[PDB]
């Protein structure tokens, strides 16, 4: 769904056609200008940060596994006459439709019996999913995965790719997969009984020598060596695949270019009228394509256990009964060919749509994790209250699109309630502390991180405990579309806090909200302050994340209640503007303004520049030549948003109906 | 009748087409949120179970035996001209109709004489019944039956499959039957005198190679090895079967799929004009598709002796008189094709219609068994007063439909008073003791159950004496639509147990009604209560079921005087998500509230999900409006043009609609 | 075939029965792949003009041309100026204005693709052999690429890219009879024609 | 801005080429383009004294098309305004004050 994911990008940013990705890691952000103004009891001070880079990091590494499941049928492309006055498939009219379009009327009773059983299981989403993955393996087939490389690196702790991904070796993306080929047989017209558990698809003219090899490899098993996002393990779709081609198919060549896969997809969709089936596969890949690099070491807990990708079962009966597919197809929405027309024009745009989607999900799960398990809307019952359709199960895409609705605060709508794709909320839905394996870089590691072994040596491999899941990403593209108090991602804001009395060289902050505001100010001024949690006896630091220049309360790494002892004597000066002061006095007022946003992408510690021309808009209106909006709002999936209502605690988040 | 069985299903239940059954046991039910409360002089203790599963276990096994009986003729199908004003065959118009036809002139006088006997032989219910069973045998053929498997187990008493079903070998449903084929001869139109005691049917065009194999096996003896419900014992319907098909009958293929049986049925109903015959066969199979696994150990008395199935004799004389069947048939009700049209569209919906019917019957036979013989509407005379027709004998479908009418509280209407199918009320009407076999687990069994021995070592085969039949199923689909105080299936309920501090926990229940509600609500709260009768000296436990989680008064297994001593310092916490009664003092007040309902099904201790399209309420009007429409768009290939439009680039072309 | 005729004439075609029998033409189009047509060479300077597989080929050799986009197989003659498009430019009256200054020594660069097509076409009616050279790629195009219609369509370039055509107007050669001469132009040029009667 | 195919942007028009190199000079980016007709390299940093670009620095009267090298854009003088990668329609609005 192009028009949906295209809306998530910020109004100022309009990306160009091509993007030459040449690495397994891409930073994306913006260069903003901050105009700070400070006032306290001592006096006033005015400064200005001329260039500030706020960015996340996203990678092409994510452990996933495929399962074949049975899902709903997509009834789009079938002729409009077999459907009655309502949006329902009548078997009374299928008998009539097949009868009028043949001379041999002996086969009508047999044809109707088989058609009735097959039409209620038609889904080509799993075939297009694999065909799309083959396109990007050939295009970006020079990305290197080194086993003894770094995953996260702060200075105290470190995670290698040996950990998080065991049973892996060093390989390029083209060298990862060695796909076998399934038998692409020819369906001779005259066969009366459709062979069971084998799909048949239509084709335009002669099946090319290259087109055979693509369809053969798309249906086969995926068995990777290196952990890659677009080369994840998938079960075998089918053994055989019939093709009702008037001209006979040619034998498989063995080799194909990425350009040849585009020609295979464009023909397969046009012949079968499977435009809505492609839209499902497009959204399903937008989830998987890229995975987040964690903000802090604790945010690696999300990516330990392998998330399951629900691939629908491959079934189709267009090859057997080509009478059912004619020139007047049935569609629910009039904008039902937009997603394919967008991809075929601008293939590399999927990267930006993928980054936009996975950001929105992992940002909002930062809030859902902090919700107490004694309210109406909680981690267990947030999807069920949101959805207003009838899917098979609240899994895959339904979970992800619910989180996008909660982020943007708008009603998202799909034509069919499809439940296919990655489920992320697995690490969240379990009342157990997660054991992230880490490497010790400095001797003073146990003071900061909640480590098992309290005495360590540089080189030792230990384990850290994570109870509450912290935010994996900060808002960048979705910055200021709706501002929560937790992130505090405002354009303009006036922070007011009262400074605690400095007894010896230490200031006690008993309250939780005041402590968050204090360290948030001192960070924007650019003062590396270090405080001691009195309950646990572990040191917290506002400079936890360098990439995103902000302080979240989850950097304390202790759910519950505590009091902090801030060290006011050892306040280091890392980055100093003219605003920056060391000695606060009385009531601290900081008023900042953010202006002059401009998007910038970094890859392999150099600037990554966009190539090609400017993207012209392709989009169809609500009506072509349709008079009355026959609402048909019974079967269509609808996802209602939730607004965060702030309360006194500040540690707990709460959702309400707007 | 699809219509009346559809209304039995709950409002929240939204069924889909396909149901992938892969076992011989299904736990259908619903998930509800129970808000329990315990109020006392000391204070209130609140609990909340967010997902409480109330289930009824249903199996695919059950001993049945078919017998060929004489039943009324179904006159729906014959041309409307030969019928008089009253609605009976006016012989004289038959002789007129045969004379003005394409019949051989020398046969008219001899055939007209036979008409008086042969035209009143119209009942194809037996053939359609067997052909429907062949459809489901080949569809769900992979289900297994093990000999030494657990039929029932409640901890104390165990009942194996060897006990109830001797002469039983372990085998799959597909490998159970080995059906021999009956002769399908071709009717010679130039036959001198019609052969009575040999049925002759009509057919459209040519009898296919597979249709011969299906009709051959349908009119044959069912001799099963494993006691399956859809493969029970049936006698040989007929030896030979004539088929008036001018196009010759092809010889038997040998093999056929489940889709080929649907092809055979649709041709047979259409040619013979026998839709009311199919409606009778649909309701027959709805009774005897699935049998309920007994709720308690002593509720196995219903399934000891084999209940007889009444199959009406196969008799059809359409082959001899082709002229009398045409396109203008005589029918009583206008909605006479609705039952077939429903089955062809949604075959797997019969499973839901079957469980709805047996749950309605076995619930009502529960509270019919607890009435004294000295009454107006009693055990023996509940069918006679309800029935306002003229059936041959009050058996089969009449006894099952009258029980459904009592449950729902509505008027059930059928077009013909047909008396065919299973008779359930067999063990009830006998009014004698039934001896169910049991294998013991513990050594302290015969205190609880009314056993034949008083001391029994573990692993011994004993006998339980059941006098009054307890309810076999708890109401789940029919929950709080026609509520009785016996089952106590309310949304809101409360009980007030009155105790004084002078009593050291010990309470005596003089009333029987509130004893039942106390013991039931304590089990929702997850507390194992063990009462002891003061008069007799037996013991009862509220934990006497692992499906519903309720206490019915028939679990006492004795009718006498009511003096139940419950000691409230021996209450043990058994389940999870439970409220604790540590030490009560004064008057106790228990209460619960069920708020929302969600349909759930379980199989092999895993969730069984419904897949496929959205099932609609098919009406007679929804198809015949498309017949009124006719697709009246004159079938004329009108090709509309597209004017090319030039713009800035001129290299690429752009087409407009006008 | 009937739906293509409906687009050309711009009328509604009606048949009594929706019959689907006859030849299907749209075969090579829908494939959307490269087609390898065989050719026997005459001259030795062939592969500059045509997108050939070899760069040096001796005369009488059997080579292959790579065709990506399908050029028009026929020019409109019976359907001339009934439903006119700017691609074919099948007007009765037409004109083009090529703007040059005396400081330029005959050399003109066509930034626009549309008026380059009309200039090269009208010069062929006037019987002048013009040979343009693309500045970006470095290939050559000749207006004399047909002996039937006598018009220049833009698909005769045999390449889709950026438009920078250098035409040197002191290498124009008079080829045909009944021709107007461009001996030595100075300033703005204005070409025009008029078709009056048809037989 | 012209579409950057490989690492080269073709400027067919004369006026647009003058405005492009005039912007990049004020930002302070030493851009070098190749004249396709002559085959000689033009540079916007021709005169250091006066900080502006005139069209006569091409040194070819007549008509031509320029191939601008977008990969080899050096950074001689950088203010905070100065960017290397232009995208779409470029707008530059400057004000001159405080003459002495």
Residue numbers in the entry:
A (entry chain CO), B (entry chain CP): 1 to 658
C (entry chain AB): 400 to 598
D (entry chain AP): 499 to 598
What does the paper say about this structure?
The two-dimensional classification of L-BC particle images identified a subpopulation of 9% of particles missing segments of their capsids. Asymmetric reconstruction of the open particles lacking a large segment of its capsid with the opening centered around a fivefold axis. The borders of the capsid opening are formed by poorly resolved density which may be caused by the limited number of images (1120) available for the reconstruction or by variations in the structure of individual open particles. The structures of capsid proteins from the empty particle were fitted into the other reconstructions. The existence of the open particles together with domain swapping within a decamer provides evidence that Totiviridae capsids assemble from the decamers of capsid proteins. Furthermore, the open particles may be assembly intermediates that are prepared for the incorporation of the virus (+) strand RNA.
